[PDB]
Amino acid sequence: DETVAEFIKRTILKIPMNELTTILKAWDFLSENQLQTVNFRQRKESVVQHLIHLCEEKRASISDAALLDIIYMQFHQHQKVWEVFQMSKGPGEDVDLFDMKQFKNSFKKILQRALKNVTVSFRETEENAVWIRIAWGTQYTKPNQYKPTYVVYYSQTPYAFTSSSMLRRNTPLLGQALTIASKHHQIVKMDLRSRYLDSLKAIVFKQYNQTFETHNMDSRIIHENIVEKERVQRITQETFGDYPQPQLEFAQYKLETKFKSSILAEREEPLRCLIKFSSPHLLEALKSLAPAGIADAPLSPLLTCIPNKRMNYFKIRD
Amino acid sequence: SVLRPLDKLPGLNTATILLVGTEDALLQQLADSMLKEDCASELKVHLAKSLPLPSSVNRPRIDLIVFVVNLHSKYSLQNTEESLRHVDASFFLGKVCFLATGAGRESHCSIHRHTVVKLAHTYQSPLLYCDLEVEGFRATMAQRLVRVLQICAGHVPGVSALNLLSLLRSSE
Amino acid sequence: HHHSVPVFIPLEEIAAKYLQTNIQHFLFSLCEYLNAYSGRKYQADRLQSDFAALLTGPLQRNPLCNLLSFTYKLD
Amino acid sequence: KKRQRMIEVQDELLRLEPQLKQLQTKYDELKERKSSLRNAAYFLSNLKQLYQ
Amino acid sequence: SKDLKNQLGHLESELSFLSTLTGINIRNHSKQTEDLTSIRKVLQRHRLSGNCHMVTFQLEFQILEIQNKERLSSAVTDLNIIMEPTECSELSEFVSRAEERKDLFMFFRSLHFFVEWFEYRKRTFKHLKEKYPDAVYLSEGPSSCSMGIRSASRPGFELVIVWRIQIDEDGKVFPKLDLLTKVPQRALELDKNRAIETAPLSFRTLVGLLGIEAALESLIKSLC
């Protein structure tokens, strides 16, 4: 049909020119002897037109376009905001023998019996990862290919990452499918959202610190307050550690505490506030606040517990 | 503790200056610009954040005090206002200077110039302007400060700090 | 404080049951678990790498390496 | 409207199963516990009186 | 040289702490290196002695480190361990098994578990010995496997409890508890209820009911 061709054309137009050959080689839909016939030296439009002609001369189904979209998304993986889930299991349950075919079958059958029209595409890659692309629909509409949902599941682990695109309408259904296909009982959402998937992976798996101990100049200038400088340096080094900080970009705090400072002494109601910290590389600008003279030597525990508590959004009450 | 100008005896051809401010990098750059040249005297530079200083006896006598005020932050203004209460009046007789930084970029200024003008006029002290981020102006400011320090230290026969107080007096 | 044990290894249960009492038993249990996992993974990897001719298709394997399934035709 | 009812009934069943599981385990372990206790008591008393 | 003495003391304290934590007291160690290069191959012969809290051992092995562009393969090509000639045959059996299998860590783990169960049996047998010195007769000693329960009233009615330590082919250690009844035929012609031939099995149920030492002291009190 024409919808598949339009989907493939849009997906190819999204791909840059310098890395298009790698994506086309990873797709492995067109034969290798058909790639050298196309000249990647001319304009992008002519190359895309020739590729569309080649993909139309051959039988192009809807699964190949979904696989190409999955490949592009897992190659970029920085265009969406990612959230984390956590699944719990009962005390009397034994360790299960994970099987990929049964997992795929259950995850497909749950959505096929709940809804009517829904597209599911799988991709099993090493690092023990399963990428799932879901196109949603119902009994009276066709699956919408413009707003897909991406899920990254790690086998035999209680964690799973998801792209927050449209699952706000079908969140309980996706949670049920995940907790049934993986043989679990409960599921909850963690207060940890971020655009950097590798940072979330390192924080959730708490493997950002990989250092273990094992045995196998112008004297005319007099710097005063040097003891305070060495003290604040020691405090910063002890609080923020010495490992490379994970890369975050946002933090949010909600405050419902009372104002304590003659001024609003008779007030018995809290002061509602919402504070947002934004930075290209968070946890690295804060570490340089105390030596620069903008904050005290020990920072507030609310700012130095981001990777340890695995939390990004905070609520504080009186 | 209160700092006093004439607590100790002077050294042999030695002049000492003290720089009080919140930004340590600017103070370090200013000290480097002051000491990068050669003069007839032996110069010494001390750096501090606020007053009073940590107690010590080894510290020689101070000849000049410069208060650096950054117009882009009220924290430095509050720090200077707090530090101005730990020096005796006898030090304000031509041995104290104010240096305002950041007047070039008016869009970044958070403090009006009238505030620092009135602050300098209240304590009867000169007021200098310089953008310490640029090296070309910082070198000239350092040379001027070195000359003022040499005048205040007593290395110029016939001119003292009390005379410099009358030389740099403003009409209004 | 921190460790390098894989996620699929049940470390939390062994810790909750043996960390506060008989620490050496906890250490030896962790040793046994890690040795068994390493041995199973080594067996699987060697079978996949060395004898690739007798195997028709790629064998199925899970991260914990506790379920194997493969078809083979010998000559 | 019926979709949400289906979802909530599935949730109810998934929440209700493990309680039945645990109850069954407790029952069929306590039964054999009692049986073994009775047998041991009988044998011990018999041997005690025999030696007496 | 006070700092050097402090460093020596700290290192000795850390060594003692590690030795009492892990459970192995290591003696001197010797290493011999040989460069047999064709990509590089090195042969390292190691030798070391030690003891585990009751048992001394001396091992000597050799490894072949094959260093190359992307891999560093180290395999124990030869191993040989020697221990004092005790009367435990299963210990020497496992010694020969680990010798033919060429494994180092499993040997230490099994030795730790074996000596732990041995000290458990030793501290269990001697406790009930002095508590009831008139109802038990330890004919061989607390470091043995058998146990003889007997009353001083009559030397005819008495039995034995057997406690053995087993090491399977995998390498794990598991004990076993049985009993054998040496009772004259007079008690058999006296009692027709026939509740003695089913004594071992039921006894296991007993030790599967409320513990080991509890069952032992219950049997002692019943025979008393």
PDB file of C-alpha atoms in Angstrom, chain A residues 113-115 138-139 176 179-180 184-185, chain D residues 3-4 6-7 10-11 14 18 21-22:
ATOM      1  CA  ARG A 113      -7.387  -9.593  24.138  1.00  0.00           C
ATOM      2  CA  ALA A 114      -7.634  -6.214  25.887  1.00  0.00           C
ATOM      3  CA  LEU A 115      -7.691  -4.007  22.783  1.00  0.00           C
ATOM      4  CA  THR A 138      -9.018   0.255  19.731  1.00  0.00           C
ATOM      5  CA  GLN A 139     -12.026  -1.624  18.347  1.00  0.00           C
ATOM      6  CA  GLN A 176      -0.614  -5.431  33.576  1.00  0.00           C
ATOM      7  CA  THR A 179       3.675  -7.851  35.176  1.00  0.00           C
ATOM      8  CA  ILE A 180       1.916 -10.831  33.560  1.00  0.00           C
ATOM      9  CA  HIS A 184       5.386 -10.814  38.636  1.00  0.00           C
ATOM     10  CA  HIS A 185       2.688  -9.607  41.036  1.00  0.00           C
TER      11      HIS A 185
ATOM     12  CA  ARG D   3     -12.764  -2.166  29.174  1.00  0.00           C
ATOM     13  CA  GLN D   4     -12.063  -0.748  32.648  1.00  0.00           C
ATOM     14  CA  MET D   6     -12.186  -6.104  32.491  1.00  0.00           C
ATOM     15  CA  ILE D   7      -8.936  -4.479  33.639  1.00  0.00           C
ATOM     16  CA  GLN D  10      -7.916  -9.006  35.989  1.00  0.00           C
ATOM     17  CA  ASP D  11      -6.176  -6.966  38.699  1.00  0.00           C
ATOM     18  CA  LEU D  14      -3.880 -11.398  39.980  1.00  0.00           C
ATOM     19  CA  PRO D  18      -0.941 -15.816  45.866  1.00  0.00           C
ATOM     20  CA  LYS D  21      -1.119 -20.359  47.193  1.00  0.00           C
ATOM     21  CA  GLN D  22       0.343 -19.497  50.607  1.00  0.00           C
TER      22      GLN D  22
END
